[PDB]
Amino acid sequence: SVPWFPKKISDLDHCANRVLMYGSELDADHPGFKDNVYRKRRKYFADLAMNYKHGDPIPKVEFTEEEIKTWGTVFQELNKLYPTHACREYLKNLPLLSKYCGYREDNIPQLEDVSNFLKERTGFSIRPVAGYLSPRDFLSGLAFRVFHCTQYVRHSSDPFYTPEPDTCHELLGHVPLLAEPSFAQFSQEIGLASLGASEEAVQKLATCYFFTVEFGLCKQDGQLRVFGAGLLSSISELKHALSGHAKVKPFDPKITCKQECLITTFQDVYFVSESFEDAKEKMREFTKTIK
Numbered sequence: 001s002v003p004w005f006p007k008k009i010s011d012l013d014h015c016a017n018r019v020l021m022y023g024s025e026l027d028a029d030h031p032g033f034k035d036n037v038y039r040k041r042r043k044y045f046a047d048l049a050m051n052y053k054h055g056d057p058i059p060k061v062e063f064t065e066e067e068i069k070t071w072g073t074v075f076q077e078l079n080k081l082y083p084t085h086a087c088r089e090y091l092k093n094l095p096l097l098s099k100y101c102g103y104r105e106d107n108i109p110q111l112e113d114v115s116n117f118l119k120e121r122t123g124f125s126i127r128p129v130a131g132y133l134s135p136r137d138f139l140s141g142l143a144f145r146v147f148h149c150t151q152y153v154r155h156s157s158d159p160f161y162t163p164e165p166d167t168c169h170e171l172l173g174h175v176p177l178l179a180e181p182s183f184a185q186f187s188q189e190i191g192l193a194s195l196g197a198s199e200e201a202v203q204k205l206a207t208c209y210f211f212t213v214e215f216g217l218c219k220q221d222g223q224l225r226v227f228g229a230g231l232l233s234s235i236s237e238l239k240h241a242l243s244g245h246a247k248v249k250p251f252d253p254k255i256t257c258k259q260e261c262l263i264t265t266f267q268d269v270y271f272v273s274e275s276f277e278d279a280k281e282k283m284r285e286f287t288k289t290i291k
Ligand SMILES: CCn1c(=O)[nH]c(=O)c2c1nc(Cc1cn3cc(C)sc3n1)n2Cc1ccc(-c2ccn(C)n2)cc1
Pocket: 021, 022, 023, 024, 025, 026, 027, 129, 131, 132, 133, 134, 135, 136, 138, 139, 148, 150, 162, 163, 164, 165, 169, 206, 209, 210, 214, 229, 230
């Protein structure tokens, strides 16, 4: 039989809370694992997300001087690389975010402001999320153009690397592309395909999501560029992906969905999409075969 799936955007209240691992449940190897102050801060953020209901303004947070410094460090170094590494759609939308949502070295943008910006541009919106969700619940958000977003900042001891999502990743990696209509349609269709799909189908859609939205490359004017959010917020892997040292393959869902998604290392392979339009067409053809 068909599993429950959300039928309207407020139904995400029922699955967005089905958290399998709360944001305060730090990995044993987390730089903040023994940091009681950081742990309390992470509990604060996770509780904000747990208490959020669709329709609410996303709670505004007063970030600490330390948090803002971490953001600034990441922001400065990544912005030096984006002109030569990022796809054209990313570079087009980044300056709009500095103008309208307060993207600056000494200011962390509020999720509510970014959500309002996205709603006007592509109808995307943000929901703060309280931890790790099943791929079914996470992807279902995309069907309503809702991106489940972390609100906390990575631990200050290691500004440039983390295997965990944080708000620097959401804001610098994901949001500039969610502002692009072609990419928003691509992402929404991953969500729509997942609704009520088999467990097997959801897993394959999640792998395709991983190797596009999180770690995708695209080819533009003959050049390899980056659009994956996980690359766009990781200075070391961003450089690596466009070095000659990375294995790259064409994006092709029936092949891509066989690839293991790696967590604590660089990816073993990256997939190159010809365009967001073409990636979208390839996923349409693929979803017919698995539903
Ligand atoms: C379709 C796969 N997929 C899923 O099945 N479910 C998701 O919940 C999910 C996801 N994908 C992403 C987004 C994501 C994960 N991730 C890791 C990076 C490094 S950059 C980045 N973006 N998320 C959101 C998410 C939210 C929180 C955690 C997490 C890990 C450790 N803690 C304490 N919390 C992990 C992932």
